[model samples]
Target: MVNVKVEFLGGLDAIFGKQRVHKIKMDKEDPVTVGDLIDHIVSTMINNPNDVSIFIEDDSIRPGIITLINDTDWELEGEKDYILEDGDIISFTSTLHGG
Candidate 1:
């Protein structure tokens, strides 16, 4: 499988037990993709499993959050559908300067 590196930048780290970075060992048959990895983080990494509005909204990444795949924008990499490869880095950075 793959060993993914996850990063929570800006103010997003608060939701993940104050850890800015983490390493997750993907199962030989899993991580299936960034979508699955998002599901795992949303369901397991946060302090509140039942209510994850801080991280997710309408089952998608909350507004104003930036997702990067290997330092490249996820938009260019097919967003959530990109299948994760070994040693891939996924990062989330918040840009909350809105109303």
Candidate 2:
């Protein structure tokens, strides 16, 4: 089971129903990774192709995005490779040009 809290920060919320905090869960026998969660979010939560482009290019998250897992940078936790567990707190923030 992958049960976690997800947040979209900065202007990124605009593409995601204009909300910031989200509680998401997935049940599977296989391991669930952050990349899997991202795909689930984009596939289930978002419906716009244009907005999808802004957050994900190809199969990877865009360059200007920062990810935090339980207040620790995802970079330190292997980014998309990080395995998700129950009750984890995850956040994604856009780092694009903003004044």
Candidate 3:
């Protein structure tokens, strides 16, 4: 098993029970990737899985949702293909809100 800290920001905490940070367990032998983490979150973490489309789409994060891995842009870490490591921190922040 591996431990990872996941965070939701920019009003996304509402779908996740109004919490922003989650420390969850993941199977280390399951070929875990950021995409897999996302799936797990939608299936087990969110109170309303249907609201996931607000964050993810087509098996990837929706437009205007910024993803970061350990404080770095996910684009620099190979996006969804980036393999997870123990104690990694992944953050998702939506930028779609109005000013």
Best by TM-score: 2
- Give the C-alpha lDDT of model 3: 0.75
Instruction: Show model 1 residue runs off by greater than 4 Å.
Output: 28-31, 47-51, 97-99
Cα lDDT of model 1 by residue, 1-99, tens digit: 567888988777766667798877646465387787777666655546443776787777766788888879988968776987777777878887446
lDDT tens digits, residue span 1-99, model 3:
788888979867767777798787766466787777777776666535578776767666676777779889988967777887878887868776665
Predictions: Cα RMSD each: 2.6, 1.9, 2.3
Lowest summed lDDT window (length 10), candidate 3: 41-50
Task: Give the Cα-based TM-score of candidate 3 against the true structure.
Answer: 0.80
Better of 1 and 2 by lDDT: 2
Q: Which structure among the candidates has the greatest lDDT?
A: 2
Top-down lDDT ranking: 2, 3, 1
Better of 1 and 3 by TM-score: 3
Error of 1 at 44 (Å): 2.7
In order of appearance, the predictions have TM-scores of 0.79, 0.85, 0.80
Tens-digit lDDT string for candidate 2 (59-89): 8777768888888988896777787787888
